[PDB]
Amino acid sequence: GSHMVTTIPFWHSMEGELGKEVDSLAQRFNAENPDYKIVPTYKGNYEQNLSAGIAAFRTGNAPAILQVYEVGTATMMASKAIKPVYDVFKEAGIQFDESQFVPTVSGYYSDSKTGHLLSQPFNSSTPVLYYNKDAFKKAGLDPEQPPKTWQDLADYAAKLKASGMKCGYASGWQGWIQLENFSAWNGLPFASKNNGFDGTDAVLEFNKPEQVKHIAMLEEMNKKGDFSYVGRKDESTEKFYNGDCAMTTASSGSLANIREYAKFNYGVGMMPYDADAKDAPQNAIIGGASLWVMQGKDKETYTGVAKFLDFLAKPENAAEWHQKTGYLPITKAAYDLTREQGFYEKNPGADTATRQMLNKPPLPFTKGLRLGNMPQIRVIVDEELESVWTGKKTPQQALDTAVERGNQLLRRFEKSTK
Ligand SMILES: O=P(O)(O)OC[C@H](O)CO
Ligand SMILES: [Co+2]
Ligand SMILES: [Mg+2]
């Protein structure tokens, strides 16, 4: 009737040092709240975790909490498999102040009609440029001056390669960085209806001259050996920390593993922008994930979930997550606490991710994205970009095809949710 501990499965995609920090947070919560036991389980990369969560729901054994990457948001929002987080709190009779979250992040994860959070913010990032300062030195570059523009990056990459580095430049999450964020950061839409927020009748718009020229630049670098393709996700993070790759654009959340494993002096810079683009940079759009609560659980489970989510949002815990991982602080209090503890004084580049998100007030179409079936559109994008790196298709053809294929998935979602 109440003597049994309530076990609460939490399925996530936090690998390496990120996962160790998730475990530390769960363990502390469990110690302070012994009526509950949060049980984190690593289920693979974000695609694998989302697929596993959806499949488990079909058979009634979904976890209580599921970490879903940012692009899965519209899909989850239309899902009948979730209990919106604001409702989890409401029905459990626990107060939660949504205004605590930084507006960019709360907006991203909020319902259009009610303004309420449908999932809980936790790990948000923007892409940053990691660079090997030691490698810069022996290539004759100023180790305190990362390339500000793509043009500069290509130049540096050539010099780093000439100096003996195995790889000059590589990128994590190419869709997120080279197209989604490339668009926002250079003042362009990724999709219509303001990057999807204004309706399911959105179409993809990333096949414009600016994006095509950008992909062409990367392909020219690839041919020269100055750019290396190493995969669709976080593969470039290890290529950087093991010394292979001199520069990588990767999640700000890669910092946990990079700090632990890089045995050289490294720096963090902002994403390069297009030198020719007037009024660039604009602002970055977030990556990372949010925490979804699955439908069909008992009241004890939802009480425990609400308590755990509240725990994660406490200033000290939100601040600790940001400081340890490189994900940006997602509450106002966590940002202020980090600043007031002198963390940014000690670690100058540690607020880069926030600064990119807030570089300028957003244009109507640089607030984030919200597109149904985006997890599959990401795969389409990866396939088409891979056809560029192999020389099978031109940058124009690949982006045109990704738009055509991707739009088919957007119309499929539109029809499904009408
Ligand atoms: O590595 P993350 O957690 O910042 O996520 C990267 C991309 O946003 C995933 O879609
Ligand atoms: Co009992
Ligand atoms: Mg569909």
Swiss-Prot record:
Gene3D superfamilies: Periplasmic binding protein-like II. GO terms for cellular component: outer membrane-bounded periplasmic space. InterPro entries: Bact_solute-bd_prot1, SBP, SBP_1_CS. Keywords: Periplasm, Signal, Transport. SUPFAM superfamilies: Periplasmic binding protein-like II (SSF53850). GO terms for biological process: transmembrane transport. It is found in: Periplasm. Coiled coil: none annotated. Sn-glycerol 3-phosphate binds at residues 46, 70, 125, 251, 288, 327, 378. Belongs to the bacterial solute-binding protein 1 family. Part of the ABC transporter complex UgpBAEC involved in sn-glycerol-3-phosphate (G3P) import. Binds G3P. The complex is composed of two ATP-binding proteins (UgpC), two transmembrane proteins (UgpA and UgpE) and a solute-binding protein (UgpB). This is sn-glycerol-3-phosphate-binding periplasmic protein UgpB. It comes from Escherichia coli O157:H7.
